[PDB]
Amino acid sequence: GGLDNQIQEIKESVELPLTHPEYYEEMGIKPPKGVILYGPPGTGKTLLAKAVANQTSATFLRVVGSELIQKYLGDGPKLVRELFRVAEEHAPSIVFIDEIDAIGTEREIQRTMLELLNQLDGFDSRGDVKVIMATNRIETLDPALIRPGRIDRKIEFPLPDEKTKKRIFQIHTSRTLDDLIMAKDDLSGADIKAICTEAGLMALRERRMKVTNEDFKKSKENVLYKK
Amino acid sequence: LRLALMLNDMELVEDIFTSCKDVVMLGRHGVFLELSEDVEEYEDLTEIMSNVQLNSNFLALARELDIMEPKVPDDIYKTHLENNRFGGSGSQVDSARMNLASSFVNGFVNQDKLLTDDGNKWLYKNKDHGMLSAAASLGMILLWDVDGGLTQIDKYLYSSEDYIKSGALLACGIVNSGVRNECDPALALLSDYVLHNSNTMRLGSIFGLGLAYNREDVLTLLLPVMGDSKSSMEVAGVTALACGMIAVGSCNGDVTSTILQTIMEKSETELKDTYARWLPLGLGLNHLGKGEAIEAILAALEVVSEPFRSFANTLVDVCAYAGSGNVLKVQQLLHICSEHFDSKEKEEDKDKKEKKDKDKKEAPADMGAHQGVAVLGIALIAMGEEIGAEMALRTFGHLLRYGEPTLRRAVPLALALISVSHDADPEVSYNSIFAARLAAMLRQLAQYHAKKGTLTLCPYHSDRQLMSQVAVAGLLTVLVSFL
Amino acid sequence: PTVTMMQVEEKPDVTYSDVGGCKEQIEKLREVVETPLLHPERFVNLGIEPPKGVLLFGPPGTGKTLCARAVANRTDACFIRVIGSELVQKYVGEGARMVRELFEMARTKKACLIFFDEIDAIGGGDNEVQRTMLELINQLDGFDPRGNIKVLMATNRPDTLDPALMRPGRLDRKIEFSLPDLEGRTHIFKIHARSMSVERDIRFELLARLCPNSTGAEIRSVCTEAGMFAIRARRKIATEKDFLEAVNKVIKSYAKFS
Structure with a gap:
């Protein structure tokens, strides 16, 4: 809600390959770099909702975090080369990487991430697949990732904490604002879609959609106490 | 009117023509009124109404003039x-x-x-x-x-x-x-x-x-x-x-x-x-x-x-066996399905797309898991021409890659009939597989046309015998199942 | 690993006719890479021995462009490069086997040229690095393989004190890499005409005379960052009026702190 310009700009951004073939093969752009995203809220659903436009008509691939690397001996970039060869044999796909927080949870991360940086640039392969990287804090990445990695476009997602919460909260009350624009510290599409989906199914349960402030603070207390 | 599609009676269309005529859109219900009626009730309808019709207006509608007079100018105008x-x-x-x-x-x-x-x-x-x-x-x-x-x-x-x-x-x-x-x-x-x-x-x-x-x-x-x-x-x-x-x-x-x-x-x-x-x-x-x-x-x-x-x-x-509650034909289907004759399996098992054409939840079966090429053809023909859910294209993923020219030639036809950005991407996959003459002619066919009615269910059983000389291809191109 | 078979430097690039303003240095480091192979008899007949190589350091600037010139203007067979990032890896001690296998392939290639990249990644206990560099100078001082072999040390920081004191034996010509000029960039653009589809409406002179302090890396960010900034919106035509903000922003916003 409200982030329509950024989602249509990232829509046109991620909708160049596999679509509009009359100019993609005649002009000759073919960028083998992809985009790199991030967000202070994160939670995977905002960035997954920004890069989710590729999932309409395509084959999706998801690799979240380097946890599968740190849970084993120093194998290093061999699994990255396995994803590179299976991505070469599976060119019509999208390489989506999310939650790059290896330091937010040391010298080896810099060298396997430097090898991932060099191999990610496509020094030995032309335009074959799109690579999308996503993290939470942009300050956690090393400065070596600036020139090779971020070459196409980066997004500046602002955290208002008093505008988007008022918009979405106004959408919920459309069917006492400082308590929820001040108490909450993170939002995404899965919250409005979650409590609105189960709110519609519950409205199918009791056949009325009346929402009282005490029942809404109880349903909020369920999610607050759940975490 | 659906009760007239299933009953195929003239008193229903007469009573709905005097009760629908007494209270007067028009060209639309003429369009699917001529599409919904079969060969019998439009000739009996056109003989009792060509007898009187009392206003000749539904005579003007129930012909090959008012089902097409709105379509052509609108198809030229609103589409580009x-x-x-x-x-x-x-x-x-x-x-x-x-x-x-x-x-x-x-x-x-x-x-x-x-x-x-x-x-x-x-x-x-x-x-x-x-x-x-x-x-x-x-x-x-x-x-x-x-x-x-x-x-x-x-x-x-x-x-x-x-x-x-x-x-x-x-x-x-x-x-x-x-x-x-x-x-x-x-x-x-x-x-x-x-x-x-x-x-x-x-x-x-x-x-x-x-x-x-x-x-x-x-x-x-x-x-x-x-x-x-x-x-x-x-x-x-x-x-x-x-x-x-x-x-x-x-x-x-x-x-x-x-x-x-x-x-x-x-x-x-x-x-x-x-x-x-x-x-x-x-x-x-x-x-x-x-x-x-x-x-x-x-x-x-x-x-x-x-x-x-x-x-x-x-x-x-x-x-x-157009369709009823006759599960005896399902157990008989499983019984006779193992016949030594390699054509009554293709046609008698090909009837699956006509028998259970409405309940598409039961149509996905284990036909692809067999080893006979003819059975894979039975599944490929069993796909059909419906809205084309993701399970259908999931079957076209494995059924698309085949070596026999009969199945490689037969797969783009159902692939482009079941889906009328998934139009050109499977065609790019065919470009990655091929790059013979028949697969090229049929893949270009799908390149151009990619973008219980008897008129749409009749003219493909003759297309089921395409594995022959080009003599059939002179009649294969004039099919009426295209809307 | 893959760097062994990928170590070959195929796909030629920037040639000599599009050099970045190099006038004297291009000869000072060209007369050792191109001419000795064209005329071997003059060096062996005229005097002591043919020269070995030069030294390149200082700011990055237009770095790797002259090595691209050596790869492009090669007469018969492109030489082999060596980077420093392949030495510092897990399971230390593989540097001896790596230098022995690249020496073995070098002798298999009738003692061709070797390019060393990023010596500061391993230079600056480093006993295995002393084994690699002392096996390099030791195995290369011998006249057995060849005398026309050429090395090229490229670095950004002069903090490699040990190579700086071991280099006067074999290496020489401790000079800066290259200074950038103002009129040569139009040739870097002329060879960037083989890049992605730049619209013909752009004039190279208008894009050339409107950007001061435009070192090889910065103009590499003009064409690279200009093209990719034209891919931000995933457009098809790349007119200079579209990315003029990318030009004056890539020279000014980057010229603020430097």
């Missing part, structure tokens, strides 16, 4: 198609077969008519089968403007070439279905009985007249046609398909001397088994419309012979 498909797909054609795929490009219409009138010699450079297909393409692009269709197809009438005028009569049969004014010039000369232009004019004229159509005079004129028994397969092909499409939706079928005559003359000479394959087409089409007919048991009594007429008998069993 680019020319890069006629120019490109009409430019990368060669080898005298990709040019046939371009004859399909010209044939399939549904705005622009540039590739239609792109100079001359396009029909002269092509072969005889391409002369029939390209001769009927101008009829397939002009299913309107009788006054214009006459002055456009008249140039190819009685020309110096036989296939030009025969395909021109076929064009005259395709352009219209309620004019019936071109019958006599072709119907008069049919009596030759050995070898004459009027045999191919019998192909295009009896086939086109079958598309235009318990009619008795055309069948008495078809009596010397069925009695001729020419070596040309398409004579009895378009004859059996013609009378069969005329006899669809009959009241509990019939056991008359028409199908009895074609069965006796079918068993007269057991040569050229293709006749024994396309005669059950008209037979089963005559069986269509029954509710309690014992004609399957009658054919099980008289027709039972060597596996040729046993294949005809199991085709009568195919058309005899």
Whole structure:
């Protein structure tokens, strides 16, 4: 809600390959770099909702975090080369990487991430697949990732904490604002879609959609106490 | 009106015409009123209403003028198609077969008519089968403007070439279905009985007249046609398909001397088994419309012979099970599914797309997990032409990659029929697989046309026998199942 | 690993006719890479021995462009490169086997040229690095393989004190890499005409005389960052009026701190 310009700009951004073939093969752009995203809220659903436009008509691939690397001996970039060869044999796909927080949870991360940086640039392969990287804090990445990695476009997602919460909260009350624009510290599409989906199914349960402030603070207390 | 689609009665359409006429949109319910009605109730409807109708207005509607008078101007106005498909797909054609795929490009219409009138010699450079297909393409692009269709197809009438005028009569049969004014010039000369232009004019004229159509005079004129028994397969092909499409939706079928005559003359000479394959087409089409007919048991009594007429008998069993609560045919289906004969599995198991066509949740089965190529064909044909969910394309993922040209050629047709950004991506996959002649012509066919009604369920069982010579390809391009 | 078979430097690039303003240095480091192979008899007949190589350091600037010139202007067979990032890896001690296998392939290639990249990644206990560099100088001082062999040391920081004191034996010509000029960039653009589809409406002179302090890396960010900034919106035509903000922003916003 409200982030329509950024989602249509990232829509046109991620909708160049596999679509509009009359100019993609005649002009000759073919960028083998992809985009790199991030967000202070994160939670995977905002960035997954920004890069989710590729999932309409395509084959999706998801690799979240380097946890599968740190849970084993120093194998290093061999699994990255396995994803590179299976991505070469599976060119019509999208390489989506999310939650790059290896330091937010040391010298080896810099060298396997430097090898991932060099191999990610496509020094030995032309335009074959799109690579999308996503993290939470942009300050956690090393400065070596600036020139090779971020070459196409980066997004500046602002955290208002008093505008988007008022918009979405106004959408919920459309069917006492400082308590929820001040108490909450993170939002995404899965919250409005979650409590609105189960709110519609519950409205199918009791056949009325009346929402009282005490029942809404109880349903909020369920999610607050759940975490 | 759906109760009239299932009942097929004239009192329902009369009561709904006086009750729907007493309270007066109009052209729309005329469109799906003529689409919803079958061959019987629009002729009985047109005979009682052509008797009175009390205002002649539903007579004006229930013809081939008001189902198309809103479509053509709206299809030209509200839609805007680019020319890069006629120019490109009409430019990368060669080898005298990709040019046939371009004859399909010209044939399939549904705005622009540039590739239609792109100079001359396009029909002269092509072969005889391409002369029939390209001769009927101008009829397939002009299913309107009788006054214009006459002055456009008249140039190819009685020309110096036989296939030009025969395909021109076929064009005259395709352009219209309620004019019936071109019958006599072709119907008069049919009596030759050995070898004459009027045999191919019998192909295009009896086939086109079958598309235009318990009619008795055309069948008495078809009596010397069925009695001729020419070596040309398409004579009895378009004859059996013609009378069969005329006899669809009959009241509990019939056991008359028409199908009895074609069965006796079918068993007269057991040569050229293709006749024994396309005669059950008209037979089963005559069986269509029954509710309690014992004609399957009658054919099980008289027709039972060597596996040729046993294949005809199991085709009568195919058309005899349009659908009901008959799980005995499901356990019987699983029982007879393991027969040694490698064709009654293909057709009797091919009936899956017609029996359970409504409940598509049970249609996905373990047919793909078998090892016979014919069974994979049974699943590929079993896909159909529905909305094309993700499970269907999931089956096209494994069924698409195959080595036999019959299945590699058969997969893009159902791939582009079940889905009318998934249009060009599977075609790019075909470009990655291929880059023979048949797969190229069919993949270009899908390149152009990629973007219980008897009219849409009839004209593909003849497409089920495409694994033959190019003689069938002259009739395969004039199918009416295209909307 | 893959760097062994990928170590070959195929796909030639920037040639000599599009050099970045190098006038004297291009000869000072060209007369040792191109001319000795063209005329071997003059060096062996005229005097002591042919020269070995030069030294390149200082700011990055237009770095790797002259090595691209050596790869492009190669007469018969492109030479082999060596980077420093392949030495510092897990399971230390593989540097001896790596230098022995690249020496073995070098002798298999009739003692061709070797390019060393990023010596500061391993330079600056480093006993295995002393084994690699002392096996390099030791195995290369011998006249057995060849005398026309050429090395090229490229670095950004002069903190490699040990190579700086071991280099006067074999290496020489301790000079800066290359200074950038103002008129030579139009040739870097002329060879960037083989890059992605730049619209013909752009004039190279208008894009050339409107950007001061435009070192090889910064103009590499003009064409690279200009093209990719034209891919931000995934457009098809790349007119200079579209990315003029990318030009004056890539020279000014980057010229703020430097």
